[PDB]
Amino acid sequence: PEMVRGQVFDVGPRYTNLSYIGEGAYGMVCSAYDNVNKVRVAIKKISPFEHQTYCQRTLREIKILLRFRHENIIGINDIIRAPTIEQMKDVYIVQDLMETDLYKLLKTQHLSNDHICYFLYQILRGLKYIHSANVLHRDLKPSNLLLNTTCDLKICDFGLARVADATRWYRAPEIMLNGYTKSIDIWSVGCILAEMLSNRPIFPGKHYLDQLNHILGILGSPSQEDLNCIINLKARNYLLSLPHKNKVPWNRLFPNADSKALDLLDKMLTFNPHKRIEVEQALAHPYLEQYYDPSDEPIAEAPFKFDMELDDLPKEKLKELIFEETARFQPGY
Numbered sequence: 015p016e017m018v019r020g021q022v023f024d025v026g027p028r029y030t031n032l033s034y035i036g037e038g039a040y041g042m043v044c045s046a047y048d049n050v051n052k053v054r055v056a057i058k059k060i061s062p063f064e065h066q067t068y069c070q071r072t073l074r075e076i077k078i079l080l081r082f083r084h085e086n087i088i089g090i091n092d093i094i095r096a097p098t099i100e101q102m103k104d105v106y107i108v109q110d111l112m113e114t115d116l117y118k119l120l121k122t123q124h125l126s127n128d129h130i131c132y133f134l135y136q137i138l139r140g141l142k143y144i145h146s147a148n149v150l151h152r153d154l155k156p157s158n159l160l161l162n163t164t165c166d167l168k169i170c171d172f173g174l175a176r177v178a179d180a181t182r183w184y185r186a187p188e189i190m191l192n193g194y195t196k197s198i199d200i201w202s203v204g205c206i207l208a209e210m211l212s213n214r215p216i217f218p219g220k221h222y223l224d225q226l227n228h229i230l231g232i233l234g235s236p237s238q239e240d241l242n243c244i245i246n247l248k249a250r251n252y253l254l255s256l257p258h259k260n261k262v263p264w265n266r267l268f269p270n271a272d273s274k275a276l277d278l279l280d281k282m283l284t285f286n287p288h289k290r291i292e293v294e295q296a297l298a299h300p301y302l303e304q305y306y307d308p309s310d311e312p313i314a315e316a317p318f319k320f321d322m323e324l325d326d327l328p329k330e331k332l333k334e335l336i337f338e339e340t341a342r343f344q345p346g347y
């Protein structure tokens with residue numbers, strides 16, 4: 015078995031020449047060469063079966079990415095795991111090899127207005143397809159926006175995605191106030207647009223309540239109509255207890271930015287999720303006029319459905335489901 019930084023990476027003989035890329039709390043990512051298709055790939059090693067929540071993420075990501083097919087969404091090429099469920103401790107997810115992500119890019123480069131518009135369009139184009147399948151991504155952030163050798167952008171990491179019915183900096187305020195809609199993703203995109211405009215996260219809270227104070231320190235205290243739409247009465251009461259804060263005009267934060275970008279940013283970062291701009295309206299915003307093309311922005315064929323609920327299933331049941339979902343990559347299915 016091939017090894018990388020002391021970790022077993024049992025993906026041969028099809029996949030060889032592994033090179034470390036990075037890792038997470040329970041998964042290492044490497045680049046590799048696919049000797050069968052003669053292409054470079056990324057391979058994520060996932061070891062989730064001791065933790066029910068990690069099993070949930072793994073199954074959600076697999077089920078959703080295997081059903082989605084869109085130029086602005088990462089695909090799954092192949093999945094490697096053991097031939098028997100008792101032997102399966104790791105899952106390897108093979109994907110097209112990307113060059114970088116927006117998080118890394120923003121660390122070293124200040125984006126021109128042209129760059130920002132181009133990246134925002136692709137995010138929203140990918141997001142339109144996602145929402146057209148009635149799916150909420152729920153964890154959009156710069157590190158989940160990958161770029162390939164030709165500067166095409168692909169949304170990845172659907173482990174927290176849900177059918178509509180790590181870092182807190184990009185989470186909508188209603189999440190931290192306890193019915194989540196497609197607007198929670200629009201908020202995240204607004205946070206990403208703000209960060210492309212300044213190479214600075216706009217709401218970098220050090221914890222839960224500090225995050226809310228950052229949001230209110232820019233947007234100002236919520237209006238009565240905004241407060242009226244907070245269903246959680248206790249969160250509404252806590253908001254009422256806070257000292258008043260005035261709205262900070264967007265052009266004081268970003269004095270050099272395109273005024274059309276600020277108008278769109280304002281419509282994405284509205285406190286009330288019901289007044290937040292939707293993805294189709296965002297694509298049609300004058301800021302994106304040079305790219306908007308509904309004849310080249312495809313949508314899903316039908317809304318996605320998990321056919322079941324995963325939140326309360328034991329990890330042993332989730333492992334059986336991951337085994338069944340990955341059988342199609344085995345010789346025998």
Ligand SMILES: Nc1ncnc2c1ncn2[C@@H]1O[C@H](COP(=O)(O)OP(N)(=O)O)[C@@H](O)[C@H]1O
Pocket residue numbers: 035036037038039041043056058088109110111112113114115157160170171
């Ligand atoms: N398909 C891919 N191609 C190239 N690099 C990739 C990739 N999928 C993930 N990566 C990279 O692997 C590293 C960790 O990815 P990931 O498994 O998603 O960790 P995390 N905790 O950010 O969610 C990151 O540096 C990421 O950019």
Ligand SMILES: *[C@@H]1[C@H](C(=O)OC(C)(C)C)C(=O)CC[C@@]1(C)C(=O)OC
Pocket residue numbers: 113114119123129132161162163164165
């Ligand atoms: C792509 C570009 C980029 O990083 O491309 C590589 C190096 C292939 C990842 C950017 O930094 C933003 C600009 C751009 C969209 C672009 O096309 O101009 C280079």
